[PDB]
Amino acid sequence: SAIELLPFHCPFAAAVNPRLAEIEKLCVDWIDEFRLYQDDAQRERLIATKAAELYARALPNAAPERVADVAKWLYWGFATDDMVYDNGPVSVRAADFLPLIVQLARIADEPRSRFGFEIPYTDALRDLTVAITAPATPGQRIEWRSTARAWFFGMSWDVAYAERGEIPSLNDYLMMRMHTGGLASWAATLGIADGFELSARDADSPAVRALLESWSTFALIINDLMSYAKEISSNIITVIARELSCSPQEAVPHAYSILDRISGLFLRLRADLLPGADQNLRALIAGMEHTWRAILDWGFTSARYTRRDSEPYQVFPGWAEQPHDTSPDPLPYPAIAWWWEQVA
């Protein structure tokens, strides 16, 4: 059922790598080297995702070769997702998905691992894994391995709900969305490409974990809002509609209220942490700011979510002056309510 989006608030300016053209060329040459498509139409559609531009907006100061290297991860994700999820009228069974997805998790860990059956573009996963991780620090590689596995595990949870034809509760969605969207993996690739790495103390600290989870969650709620029109589940709109027994359109103001409250908490934790932040935590926070803006700027020009080739699936609803839910109270969802304990 059709919805009308509300305008988005973002207090951070647009940013883009000034060598985007070179980044895009490196990525298109890689897409053609590994033939990440079955036909010319698929090739055009994959290029039209503009995965290079999304990373270039998240990494405006990074070396273009390294932005291209991490962009391969997202192009591979799009090319593989356009295959595994387009697997017939019947929904993918979790029992069929799990044995394949653990093989891809293994290749991300150790690309020398090979199997008796491999899906198309597995050679490309080996190549991008080496390209991204070979120049990285040991600590960055450990983070790449753990965050890749968490994403693949998250995907399996989405498959479970799709098989059952069921919608998760809002509390369960708010716990798992950060995993199903692989935003920890995103953050790991920002560190590798931009050349930053959190101390174990910072990475483990509950305030930084709350910063990472709140950012991860609201970023992927924006993803859900931009994707809904094209999708028309486990979309925030469908989850809230079921939770509150209301229409998808009635769910919209609730979705933006949650977005405002989680984004608001992120900004509070950002304000708490920046003064004492070392160069690595400062670099991560910069990457988080650039990612928030990047998702909105790229989201409404990419063919991935909002745009046809033709009238877009989702027109840009505009920019909001302030977030109109300023309630500082913790969200009543005990999977994530602990974030608010970390406000100084």
Automatic annotation (TrEMBL):
<comment type="similarity">
    <text>Belongs to the terpene synthase family.</text>
</comment>
<keyword id="KW-0479">Metal-binding</keyword>
<protein>
    <recommendedName>
        <fullName>Terpene synthase</fullName>
        <ecNumber>4.2.3.-</ecNumber>
    </recommendedName>
</protein>
<dbReference type="GO" id="GO:0010333">
    <property type="term" value="F:terpene synthase activity"/>
</dbReference>
<dbReference type="GO" id="GO:0046872">
    <property type="term" value="F:metal ion binding"/>
</dbReference>
<dbReference type="InterPro" id="IPR008949">
    <property type="entry name" value="Isoprenoid_synthase_dom_sf"/>
</dbReference>
<keyword id="KW-0460">Magnesium</keyword>
<keyword id="KW-0456">Lyase</keyword>
<dbReference type="InterPro" id="IPR034686">
    <property type="entry name" value="Terpene_cyclase-like_2"/>
</dbReference>
<dbReference type="Pfam" id="PF19086">
    <property type="entry name" value="Terpene_syn_C_2"/>
</dbReference>
